[PDB]
């Protein structure tokens, strides 16, 4: 139990000089002996000669004579690149010597300025000094938002440092495959960049280093001989940077600054991390009908959730105000419920997998069969409405039969004549919109995932009441047929479906303007 | 199932629901899945508390293969809960071949009939079943 | 250099061994379940082992106490003799429990490693960087503080920039520009092309053209976007596009001629 | 359309990048002819103000541009359809 650890085990590394040199010379002087010179061209034999040059006092000189093919290792830029990459955390200073141009000379120091501060105890490191390390580690201009320092002991022994960058980098969503955010060190010598095995794809915004004292290394010391040990590292890392967020979530003003910078990455991991999505869902926040100025946690919805609610009501669409005004939302607002607004394309992919939260199911406000708890004095109105409108909805299908699967009276409308909702299974209007717009997805096989449109009408609203009077006189009257396509088009348009034939609607509203201007017969 | 069983991994009550069918020619085993159970009688009885042996899953595969061949529940008209529990547990029952489709050729319908006969048997045939169905294609 | 300690490790949640005909996310939770149940049956085996050990250890000890009592004032051999047969049977049973005690620790060694046998936690600390201070200072005192510190920097720039309108000085410059993250530079180089407009030599003003066109384009993009001019970066200067060549000389003429 | 549908939008930068619109009118068309005659008879007519927006929205749709608020287009179309049905 002496307190040194060194990089010595294999015994072959010195002969790597002959990758680059044609001849090698070593002058050494050890205490308790005289100075000798050792020389070889890797030719199967070497010579040892007592040296009589300048006094060294103590030390070694390794003189490589280079191959012409390798001349670039003499240059300042390549010595800088290599020592920064591989060796910047050697304890002892590393120094370089060159010329100036007044005219003559320089020496240069500190190719390894930065100390490997993860060796120091976390009580003895200031929040300034962590930030000073981070800048250099990442080559950034600005400090970290938060940091985690931990260690593991037993058979797999390591130190670690984790940083949460303050603003996402411009390239974060992109796939340049450098995977350099996490660095693996053994005994303070660099082994590898993470190569997507130390941290999951969606957590790749984390900058840090892992340092362990021993690991089954490959003969070139670039790789691990037992690959599974990288996964046992990743299960520790992933678990702890999750804990980091929670602590960060007690600091509300920093949390919103984190969340606005990285929110999608959480959601991207709901879609992919089948184990931790319980934990990750508690980190989500959204806008809602209540507190429309600031996001609220999904647990807070439950806290406020009325004793009669059985589910969490949500709606997805192109913006906050477009969602807040949408025709599906009026009844749930009137009845004092809370609607969650989900206004990003990525919300569809996390909502596919987040089927429930805290034992409560998530229900879409834009799907058929929407249940909102019933009053018996409402239930009787619904029954007599269903009875009186039966002819209108039957005749409306009899005209519109190609386009809708089903037609019925609406339960979620106030202040609009009609709306269109999708079947329970398949893409709602917004997910159709997004899937149609993908650059590299084959939509030909959509047939099993496309939902079917069920049309619902407001029994109270004047236009639908008038339409039962209009349909009453003549079931075959084209003038009521012509509404039930125009109203359908107008309802589609509000619900997020594209017109597959937009010119027809346009020409209708231009024929409407020929009414509004008194020129409908061109006279 | 073949790739699975090679790892001594057993889930009881393999069924037609816990399997998922996706876009493309794409069918894939899951875990989500009184209630509609399908069982070898060894599992039904109180007798041995770990009825874990692979043969149970093979015979339960034989049941879901007959669902694939019938497109309707086994025992759907024959029984209520008392008869379907008791007679199967006593080893004294079979679902009807009336619902098994005759648009199947002799090769696979006979192999499915052997998947009924496996109730009588202790044979963990999965790689050889796989060979048999594969080659009969 | 033996690595045999690392030979066998079990990892649930491994993507390198998912079968294509199985739902991957189902298989991980299902493979995790098997690990924990295997461990619990082996923990139960340690309880039944210890039950067997305790019974033998106690019943041999009770037999030994009665043997020692029966050796005091000997006479009536039946007890003392039968206790040799009881000690023999209890020892024969104990030797089976010793074989099971060896089999226990041998099986604990022979089972593969996993995520919570390989490891136990050391120290752990989590810190949040409570924000840097924000401030404001007069246009005159900041422009003086920049200029008085920049009398060496902008000399070092016209010299290191000194090869015209191509890649070379970017290798030297972009690291030094970390000092210039604070710069507001738009004034100085242009006040310098303004300094001797009556008399100045073409090379040094053509380097102001180059510095100012590249930096001023960046500053226009930094107004046009959220970005810091160190974070947005001269990777974009690789572009062959006509917008560098034609427009550069057009503005060189405009900015030289007007003053 | 495509950029707005991407999962990994990077939405702030695209919110700058989106380019602006120019409206084109057909000089020979009965609508433009009428609207001009109306606007020449009274430049400040609330009817031509209400027209120019209704006309404009229709051109967003035919050009591939989504509305800011599809609901208010539909309310304005229903303010017209109540004439169409004699309701109010
Ligand atoms: N400058 C030096 N001063 C003292 N001893 C040295 C020096 N350079 C090499 N050695 C000696 O030469 C031996 C061989 O070194 P070499 O790099 O080839 O193997 P190693 O360091 O032991 O293992 P590895 O291949 O992993 O680096 C060392 O173990 C050490 O005894």
Q: Which residue's CA is minimally distant from atom 13 of ligand 1?
A: A11
Q: How far apart are CA A213 and CA C211, in angstroms?
A: 49
| Subunit contact C126:A243, Cβ cutoff 8 A | yes
The C-alpha R_g of chain D, in whole angstroms, comes to 17
List CB contacts of C161: < 8 A, sequence separation 6 or more: C169, C173, C207, C210, C211
A·C CB contacts under 8 A = 113
CB A70 within 8 A of CB A20: yes
> What angle is formed at CA C80 by the lines to CA C77 and CA C86, rounded to 5 degrees?
135
Distance from CA of A20 to the nearest CA of D (A): 46
List CB contacts of A354: < 8 A, sequence separation 6 or more: A270, A277, A281, A362
| Subunit contact B29:C26, Cβ cutoff 8 A | yes
Distance A94 CA to ligand 1 centre (A): 18
- The DSSP 8-state label assigned to residue A450 in this structure reads B
Distance A186 CA to ligand 1 centre (A): 17
Place of tokens 């060294």: A56
| Subunit contact A275:C13, Cβ cutoff 8 A | yes
Q: How far apart are CA C129 and CA A165, in angstroms?
A: 11
Mutation test of ligand 1: which of A9, A14, A17, A30 has the most ligand atoms closer than 8 Å to its C-beta? A14
Place of tokens 């002799």: B106
- The DSSP 8-state label assigned to residue B12 in this structure reads S
Which helix (H) or strand (E) segment holds residue A98: the answer is: strand A96-99
Q: Is A35 helix (H, G, I), strand (E, B) or coil?
A: coil
The DSSP bridge partners found for residue A313 are: A339, A363
User: Is the minimum CB–CB distance between C172 and chain A shorter than 8 Å?
Assistant: no
Task: Provide DSSP, A215-244.
Answer: --B-TTSSSBSSTTHHHHHHHHHHHHHHHH
Place of tokens 């796939």: A175
Q: How far apart are CA A370 and CA A310, in angstroms?
A: 12
C234 closest CA partner among C212, C250, C215, C220: C215
Residue from the list D10, D30, D77 with its beta carbon closest to the beta carbon of A522: D30
Count how many domains chain B has. 1
Structural domain boundaries enclosing B56: 1-136
Q: Which residue's CA is minimally distant from atom 6 of ligand 1?
A: A60
- The DSSP 8-state label assigned to residue C113 in this structure reads B
For residue A445, which residues of chain B lie inside 8 Å, CB to CB?
23-24
Cβ–Cβ contacts within 10 Å for residue A267, how many?
25
Interruptions in chain C after residues (C–N over 2.5 Å): none
| Subunit contact A243:C25, Cβ cutoff 8 A | no
List CB contacts of C230: < 8 A, sequence separation 6 or more: A141, C177, C178, C181
Place of tokens 């477009």: A322
- Indicate which atom in ligand 1 lies nearest the CA of residue A14: 18
**What are the Cα distances from residue B4, in Å, to B47, B62, B122, B127?**
27, 16, 19, 11
Distance A17 CA to ligand 1 centre (A): 12
Does B2 qualify as catalytic in the annotation?
Answer: no
- The DSSP 8-state label assigned to residue A161 in this structure reads E
A389 marked as binding residue: no
Calculate helix-pair angle for C202-224, C242-257, nearest 10 degrees: 120
- CA closest to C227 among chain D residues: D13
Cβ–Cβ contacts within 10 Å for residue A138, how many?
17
Which pairing describes strands B26-29 and B19-22: parallel, antiparallel, or unpaired?
antiparallel
| Subunit contact B24:A449, Cβ cutoff 8 A | no
Tokens of A205: 């915004």
CB A219 within 8 A of CB A10: yes
For residue D74, which residues of chain A lie inside 8 Å, CB to CB?
327, 416, 490-491, 493-494
Residues in chain C, overall count = 259
Q: Is A369 helix (H, G, I), strand (E, B) or coil?
A: coil
Q: How far apart are CA A297 and CA A224, in angstroms?
A: 42
CB A212 within 8 A of CB A156: yes
**CA end-to-end distance (rounded Å), chain D:** 38
For residue D12, which residues of chain C lie inside 8 Å, CB to CB?
226
User: Is the minimum CB–CB distance between D16 and chain C shorter than 8 Å?
Assistant: yes
- The DSSP 8-state label assigned to residue A430 in this structure reads H
Mutation test of ligand 1: which of A7, A13, A220 has the most ligand atoms closer than 8 Å to its C-beta? A13
| Subunit contact D77:A325, Cβ cutoff 8 A | no
Q: Is B2 helix (H, G, I), strand (E, B) or coil?
A: helix
Find which of C5, C127, C236 to mutate to test the A interface (most A CBs within 10 Å of its CB): C127
Label residue A215 exposed, middle or buried (CB < 10 Å: 0-12, 13-18, 19+).
buried
**What are the Cα distances from residue A326, in Å, to A332, A388, C30, C198?**
12, 27, 43, 67
Domain with residue B99: its CATH number is 1.10.510.10
CB A276 within 8 A of CB A203: no
For residue D16, which residues of chain C lie inside 8 Å, CB to CB?
224-225
CB A432 within 8 A of CB A450: yes
Q: In units of Å, what resolution does this entry have?
A: 3.3
CA dihedral A465, A467, A472, A476 (to 10 degrees): -160
**What are the Cα distances from residue C116, in Å, to A33, A40, A198?**
52, 51, 17
Q: How far apart are CA B88 and CA B91, in angstroms?
A: 5
Residues in chain D, overall count = 88
A328 marked as binding residue: no
Place of tokens 């105890």: A121
Tokens of C146: 């920049």
**What are the Cα distances from residue D63, in Å, to A11, A395, A503?**
73, 34, 10
Residue from the list C19, C21, C30 with its beta carbon closest to the beta carbon of B31: C30
Burial A143-177 (b: 16+ CB within 10 A, else e): bbbbbbbbbbeeebbbbbbbbbbbbeeeebeeeee
Task: Provide DSSP, A314-340.
Answer: EEE-S-HHHHHH-TTSHHHHHTT--EE
| Interchain touch B–D (≥3 Cβ pairs closer than 8 Å) | no
User: Is the minimum CB–CB distance between C225 and chain D shorter than 8 Å?
Assistant: yes
Which chains have 3 or more CB–CB distances shorter than 8 Å to chain D? A, C
| Subunit contact C13:A145, Cβ cutoff 8 A | no
Q: How far apart are CA B81 and CA B88, in angstroms?
A: 11
Which residues sit with their C-beta closer than 6 Å to ligand 1? A 7-14, 60
- CA closest to D62 among chain A residues: A502
Q: How far apart are CA A474 and CA A203, in angstroms?
A: 64
Cβ–Cβ contacts within 10 Å for residue A464, how many?
21
Q: How far apart are CA A153 and CA A30, in angstroms?
A: 38
Distance A114 CA to ligand 1 centre (A): 25
Tokens of A490: 């107008």
Q: How far apart are CA C194 and CA C182, in angstroms?
A: 23
- Indicate which atom in ligand 1 lies nearest the CA of residue A60: 1
Q: How far apart are CA A123 and CA C125, in angstroms?
A: 8
Cβ–Cβ contacts within 10 Å for residue A317, how many?
24
Mutation test of ligand 1: which of A11, A64, A186, A218 has the most ligand atoms closer than 8 Å to its C-beta? A11
Label residue A266 exposed, middle or buried (CB < 10 Å: 0-12, 13-18, 19+).
buried
Q: How far apart are CA D31 and CA D9, in angstroms?
A: 40
Q: Which residue's CA is minimally distant from atom 3 of ligand 1?
A: A60
- The DSSP 8-state label assigned to residue A518 in this structure reads T
| Subunit contact A494:D71, Cβ cutoff 8 A | yes
- CA closest to C223 among chain D residues: D16
Burial C153-177 (b: 16+ CB within 10 A, else e): bbeebeeebeeebeeebbeebeeeb
For residue C119, which residues of chain A lie inside 8 Å, CB to CB?
152-156, 232, 236
- Identify the experimental approach: cryo-EM
């Amino acid at each position: 139990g002496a307190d040194i650890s060194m990089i010595g085990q294999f015994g072959v590394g010195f002969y790597s000089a002959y990758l680059v040199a044609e001849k090698v010379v070593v002058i050494t002087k050890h205490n308790d002996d005289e100075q000798y010179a050792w020389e070889s061209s890797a030719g199967g034999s070497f010579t040892v000669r007592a040296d009589h040059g300048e006094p060294i006092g103590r030390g070694t000189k390794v003189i490589l004579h280079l191959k012409e093919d390798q001349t670039e290792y003499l240059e300042e830029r390549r010595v800088k690149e290599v020592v920064k990459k591989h060796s910047q955390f050697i304890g002892y200073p590393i120094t370089l010597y060159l010329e100036k141009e007044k005219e003559k000379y320089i020496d240069q120091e500190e190719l390894n300025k930065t100390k490997p501060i993860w060796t120091r105890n976390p009580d003895d490191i200031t929040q300034e000094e962590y930030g000073e390390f981070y800048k250099s580690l990442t080559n950034d201009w600005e400090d970290h938002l938060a940091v985690k320092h931990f260690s593991v002991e037993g058979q797999l022994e390591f130190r670690a440092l984790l940083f949460i960058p303050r603003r996402a980098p411009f390239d974060l969503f992109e796939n340049k495959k450098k995977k350099n955010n996490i660095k693996l060190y053994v005994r303070r010598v660099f082994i590898m960049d993470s190569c997507d095995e130390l941290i999951p794809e969606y957590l790749n915004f984390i900058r840090g280093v892992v340092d362990s004292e021993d690991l089954p290394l490959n003969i070139s010391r670039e790789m691990l001989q037992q690959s599974k040990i990288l996964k046992v590292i990743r299960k520790n890392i992933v678990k702890k940077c999750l804990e980091l967020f929670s602590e960060l979530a007690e600091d509300k003003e920093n949390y919103k600054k984190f969340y606005e910078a990285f929110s999608k990455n959480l959601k991207l991991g709901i879609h992919e991390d089948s184990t931790n999505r319980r934990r990750l869902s508690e980190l989500l926040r959204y806008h809602t009908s209540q507190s429309g100025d600031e996001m609220t946690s999904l647990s807070e919805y439950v806290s406020r959730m009325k004793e009669t609610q059985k589910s969490i009501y949500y709606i997805t669409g192109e913006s906050k105000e477009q969602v807040a005004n949408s025709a599906f939302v009026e009844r749930v607002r009137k009845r004092g419920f809370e609607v969650v607004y989900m206004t990003e394309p990525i919300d569809e992919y996390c909502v596919q997998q987040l089927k429930e939260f805290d034992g409560k199911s998530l229900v879409s406000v834009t799907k058929e069969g929407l249940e909102l708890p019933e009053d018996e004095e409402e239930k009787k109105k619904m029954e007599e409405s269903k009875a009186k409108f039966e002819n209108l909805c039957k005749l409306m299908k009899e005209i519109l039969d190609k386009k809708v699967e089903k037609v019925t009276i609406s339960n979620r409308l106030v202040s609009s004549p009609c709306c269109i909702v999708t079947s329970t299974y398949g893409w709602t209007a917004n997910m159709e919109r997004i899937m149609k717009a993908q650059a590299l997805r084959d939509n030909s096989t959509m047939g099993y995932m496309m939902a079917k449109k069920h049309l619902e009408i407001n029994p109270d609203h004047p236009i639908v009441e008038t339409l039962r009077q209009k349909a009453e006189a003549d079931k075959n009257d084209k003038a009521v047929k012509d509404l039930v396509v125009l109203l359908f088009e107008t309802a589609l348009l509000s619900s997020g479906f594209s017109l597959e034939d937009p010119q027809t609607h346009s020409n209708r509203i231009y024929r409407m303007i020929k009414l509004g201007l008194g020129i409908d017969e061109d006279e | 199932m073949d790739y699975l069983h090679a790892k001594n991994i057993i889930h009881r009550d393999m069924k037609s629901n816990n399997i998922f069918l996706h876009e493309g020619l794409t069918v894939k085993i899951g875990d989500f899945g009184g209630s509609v159970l399908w069982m070898a009688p060894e599992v039904i009885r109180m007798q041995d508390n770990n009825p874990f042996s692979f043969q149970s899953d093979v015979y339960s595969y034989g049941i879901v293969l007959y669902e694939l061949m019938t497109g309707e529940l086994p025992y759907s008209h024959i029984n209520n809960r008392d008869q379907i529990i008791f007679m199967v547990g006593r080893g004294y029952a079979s679902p009807d071949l009336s619902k098994l489709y005759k648009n199947c050729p002799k090769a696979m319908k006979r192999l499915v009939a052997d998947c009924v006969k496996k109730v009588k048997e202790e044979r963990p045939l999965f790689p050889q079943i796989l060979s048999s169905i594969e080659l009969l294609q | 250099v033996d690595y045999s300690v690392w030979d066998h490790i079990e990892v649930s949640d491994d993507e390198d061994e998912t079968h294509p005909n199985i739902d991957t996310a189902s298989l991980f939770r299902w493979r995790h379940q098997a690990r924990v149940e295997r461990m619990e049956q082996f923990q139960k085996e340690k309880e039944e082992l210890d039950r067997g050990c305790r019974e033998c250890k106690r019943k041999v000890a009770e037999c030994q106490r009665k043997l020692k009592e029966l050796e005091v004032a000997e006479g009536g051999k039946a007890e003392l003799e039968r206790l040799q047969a009881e000690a023999q049977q209890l020892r024969k049973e104990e030797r089976s429990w010793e074989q099971k005690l060896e089999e226990m620790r041998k099986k604990e060694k022979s089972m593969p490693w996993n995520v919570d046998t390989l490891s136990k936690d050391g120290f752990s600390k989590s810190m949040v960087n409570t924000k840097p201070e924000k401030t404001e200072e007069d246009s005159e005192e900041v422009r003086e503080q920049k200029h008085k510190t920049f009398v060496e920097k902008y000399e070092k720039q016209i010299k290191h920039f000194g090869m015209l309108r191509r890649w070379d000085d970017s290798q030297k410059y972009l690291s030094d520009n970390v000092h210039l993250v604070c710069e507001e530079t738009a004034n100085y180089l242009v006040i310098w092309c303004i300094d001797l407009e009556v008399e100045e030599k073409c090379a040094l003003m053509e380097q102001v053209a180059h510095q100012t066109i590249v930096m001023q384009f960046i500053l226009e993009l930094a107004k046009s976007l959220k970005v810091d001019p160190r974070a947005c970066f001269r990777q974009f200067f690789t572009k062959i596009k006509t917008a560098d060549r034609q427009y550069m000389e057009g503005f060189n003429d405009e900015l030289e001629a007007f003053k």
